[PDB]
């Protein structure tokens, strides 16, 4: 069967350097689908008594986040939610302070996951956490990894990982994975053992980036462009898929 194609798209709140309101994000997503027809869309999103007005620009409110997802979900786009606040604020410093491993496994991570699916019921496909990131914080044991994967698979979520440190246990757990290769290594043996589970995000440098990927297994490839400014920059290479075919 032919392979799948997606346009990995980053969305953030209006701030000092860019961003767009839920109306602007909705219009851009409609303009991408208007050009790219049979191409999937992967929208990345960062997390923002609980607001209505954003406490400081550069972050969305929970309503604006829901308004974007509900519009992107209606377009058929998959949502990948970034739970970076798992290291946010020992405190009163804005650092990436790491709570004890128990405090995170026992309480916060299930807490954040419950809050997650409470705000976006069944409308999130992948979730990103800065824990499997080559270890960094905490050295995860054998059962510790598969416990976090169980919390994610419980709520029907996939995972986005930057490091392929634990990829050889994620696929055994049968959970969909999103490998961000937009600047480790991986053998094509995985694509014949787990074809419908891996989706590789690549930095678009040319058609040679796709051909090098399609030469292996990669039946699910997401394209992330370098560069609301990017509306037209993506509308340049959006014709790079009508003629690409390659199926």
Author numbering: 3 to 50, 58 to 59, 61 to 99, 116 to 209, 220 to 263, 267 to 286
What text comes from the article?
Here, we present a strategy for the de novo design of a simplified scaffold of an endo-α-N-acetylgalactosaminidase active site, a glycoside hydrolase from the GH101 enzyme family. Using a combination of trRosetta hallucination, iterative cycles of deep-learning-based structure prediction, and ProteinMPNN sequence design, we designed proteins with 290 amino acids incorporating the active site while reducing the molecular weight by over 100 kDa compared to the initial endo-α-N-acetylgalactosaminidase. Of 11 tested designs, six were expressed as soluble monomers, displaying similar or increased thermostabilities compared to the natural enzyme. Despite lacking detectable enzymatic activity, the experimentally determined crystal structures of a representative design closely matched the design with a root-mean-square deviation of 1.0 Å, with most catalytically important side chains within 2.0 Å.
dEngBF4 crystallized in two different space groups, P212121 (form 1) and P61 (form 2), and the crystal structures of the protein were determined using the molecular replacement method described in Materials and Methods. Form 1 has two protein molecules, 1A and 1B, in the asymmetric unit, whereas for form 2 one protein molecule is present in the asymmetric unit, resulting in three separate structures. All three structures aligned with an RMSD of 1.0 Å or less, revealing a common (β/α)8-barrel organization with an overall fold similar to the hallucinated model. Likewise, another extended loop region including His91-Lys127 harboring the two tryptophan residues, making up the tryptophan lid in EngBF, displayed both low pLDDT confidence scores and flexibility in the molecular dynamics simulation. The movement of this loop, however, is constrained due to the formation of a disulfide bond between Cys124 and Cys163 residues, potentially contributing to the observed high thermostability in dEngBF4. While ProteinMPNN proved to be highly effective in improving the pLDDT confidence score, certain loop regions remained unrecoverable, which correlated with regions displaying poor or no electron density in the crystal structure. Enzymatic assays of the dEngBF proteins with Galβ(1–3)GalNAcα1-para-nitrophenol as a substrate showed no measurable para-nitrophenol release during the designated incubation period (data not shown).
